Amino acid sequence: EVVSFGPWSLDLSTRTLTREGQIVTLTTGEFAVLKALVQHPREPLTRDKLMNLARGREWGAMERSIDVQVSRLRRLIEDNPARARYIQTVWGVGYVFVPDGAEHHH
Amino acid sequence: EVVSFGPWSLDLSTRTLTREGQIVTLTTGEFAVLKALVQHPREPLTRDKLMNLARGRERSIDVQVSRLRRLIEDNPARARYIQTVWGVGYVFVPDGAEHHH
Numbered sequence: 766e767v768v769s770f771g772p773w774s775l776d777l778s779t780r781t782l783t784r785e786g787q788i789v790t791l792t793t794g795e796f797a798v799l800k801a802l803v804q805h806p807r808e809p810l811t812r813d814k815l816m817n818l819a820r821g822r823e824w825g826a827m828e829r830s831i832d833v834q835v836s837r838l839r840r841l842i843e844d845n846p847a848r849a850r851y852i853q854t855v856w857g858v859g860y861v862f863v864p865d866g867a868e869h870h871h
Numbered sequence: 872e873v874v875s876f877g878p879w880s881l882d883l884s885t886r887t888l889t890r891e892g893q894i895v896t897l898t899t900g901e902f903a904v905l906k907a908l909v910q911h912p913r914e915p916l917t918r919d920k921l922m923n924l925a926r927g928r929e930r931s932i933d934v935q936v937s938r939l940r941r942l943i944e945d946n947p948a949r950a951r952y953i954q955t956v957w958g959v960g961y962v963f964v965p966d967g968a969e970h971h972h
Contacts (some may be wrong), residue, residue, distance in 0.1 A: 790930050790931070790934060792898070792900050792931045792932070792934055792935060793900055793926055793929075793931050794899055803958045820899050826886065826898045826900065827886065827896075827897070827898075827899055829896045830896065830897065830899055833896060833898060834898060835920045841946050
């Protein structure tokens with residue numbers, strides 16, 4: 766079960782993120798949040814749903830953790846982190862994984 | 872069970888890190904690694920012992936420690952609370968005391 770997006774590939778078996786031959790170091794949390802997003806393409810996830818998927822509901826009180834984790838994923842995977850395309854912000858709700866990097870209008 | 876080090880306080884009950892009245896945002900991993908370290912003061916932990924304590928179920932740890940350091944250390948390049956045990960892993964020194972003392 767390997768998912769691709771632009772130059773990135775994520776292998777959910779070996780829990781590895783690759784690009785251009787190199788395996789990139791992710792934290793367990795970054796991996797868990799990325800996994801959740803790629804397993805829900807084009808579906809908006811609230812910050813709570815993301816934490817519930819990534820880490821379980823016993824961590825729910827550290828919800829703000831997710832915004833930090835997403836911003837670190839973005840610095841890594843986005844052509845331009847300030848203009849994220851793979852992980853887009855759903856305003857007032859949370860985040861959405863767009864595998865093709867397509868804007869809202871398409 | 873609240874532990875202090877310099878201006879920092881960590882409440883293992885409410886899982887909150889405070890300084891100067893402000894609660895600081897940690898990731899679950901940063902919290903788990905910090906908890907492990909403060910629960911083992913002056914005991915060198917290998918990278919594996921740290922991962923076993925933090926997450927049960929690991930290069931992740933070095934990244935997590937370096938982020939903890941950027942946050943908690945007066946000078947991150949000269950860590951005093953989280954010191955490097957060369958070739959082994961890391962040690963939590965609550966008073967920030969150097970190796971010679």
